[PDB]
Ligand binder design. Structure first.
Ligand SMILES: O=C(O)Cc1c(-c2ccccc2)c2cc(Cl)ccc2[nH]c1=O
Ligand SMILES: O=C(O)Cc1c(-c2ccccc2)c2cc(Cl)ccc2[nH]c1=O
Ligand SMILES: [Mg+2]
Ligand SMILES: [Mg+2]
Lengths: 143, 144, 55, 56
């Protein structure tokens, strides 16, 4: 897979919206609890992600927040190609499993989400997802 | 060395911007946080610790950085704290400079902050800061 | 390098992306599909591939 | 080793600790803070493990 392809999707827990991004080639993920499942929140999440990693292509479903004009504006500003229409779907299930494992270690869901992201990215198989994405991108960097 | 970070807060438009810089690379991350508290600082650290190998954080003695909540987060994530160079202070000025250049391109400050972080990390020298941190960390992974 | 997003027919949702043809101090001239439109500056958002250029 | 407890007592809102975890009940926890043994209700105690540290 290309080092610049990401999949984004939303999942829900305890009445709150969780926006999840996965680097397809590595399995590395990032997640945020967002106050509303809107294009404004999705566009802000993408600009943060695009500043951290080389984000060239994002694949989402046709959720209204992902097709919003605000997201189109952010992707044009950051140089991100959008494509519409199971890695992230299975990742939502994996994230929810890890959240439940550590849920009692935190009062707020947002804390447990970031605990679960930590565990997912640091767990070794071997390399961890966090080690794989760093390795994949560094190899892609030209001399 | 690839796990050393400097964190500090700066202010614009009455709002608090929490900035983390990977000292060895100059790579930065920034968030506008609703309050300059240990609660918000600890949440920022847990997110940061999940992205990068964060082993040591250098801050000043701001109450949010010395708070018990942050000590709790650092204990959970395995982060060593050290208090009391100028890299982050000089980075706050650099970040504010880029924010003003792109401020009119966005209504909300939080949007301009993330535009400025993008520009700082993608700008070529040469390598960019975003390329350097990935290179530094990957080199420490592949050589072990 | 430029894409324009805009509002016009009393529709609050931002339309576009449109091609930027000319930029005046009070309005911009854009092309969306086969229709050429004149949009006031306050009702238009000219967005640059600014981050894209910093590659 | 693996557990640190932060707590509030004496009507003081600032979190004290870290304290050693002796026992965790559903209603209270038994802790030791610098030779002092204390019993603290669950809502006034936060038991934090180096879970991420060990998992990483
Ligand atoms: O419970 C939450 O979701 C986070 C949280 C923590 C905390 C921070 C890191 C790991 C686990 C919990 C906390 C910790 C202390 Cl020592 C005091 C107040 C605190 N208040 C909070 O809200
Ligand atoms: O102005 C902000 O701070 C972000 C923002 C954008 C925007 C997003 C990325 C780059 C530039 C502006 C926006 C864009 C459109 Cl086409 C419609 C509504 C919008 N509303 C917003 O709030
Ligand atoms: Mg979906
Ligand atoms: Mg400071």
């Amino acid at each position: 897979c290309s080092p610049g392809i990401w999949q984004l999707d939303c999942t829900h827990l305890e009445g709150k919206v969780i926006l999840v991004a996965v680097h397809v080639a590595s399995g590395y993920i990032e997640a945020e609890v967002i106050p509303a499942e809107t294009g404004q929140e999705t566009a802000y999440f993408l600009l943060k992600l695009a500043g951290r990693w080389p984000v060239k292509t994002v694949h989402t479903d046709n959720g209204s927040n992902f097709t919003s004009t605000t997201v189109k504006a952010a992707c044009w500003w950051a140089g991100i190609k959008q494509e519409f229409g199971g890695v992230i779907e299975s990742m939502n299930k994996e994230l929810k499993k890890i959240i439940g494992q550590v849920r009692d270690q935190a009062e707020h869901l947002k804390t447990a989400v970031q605990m679960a992201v930590f565990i997912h990215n640091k767990k070794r198989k071997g390399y961890s997802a966090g080690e794989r994405i760093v390795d994949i991108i560094a190899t892609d960097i030209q001399t």
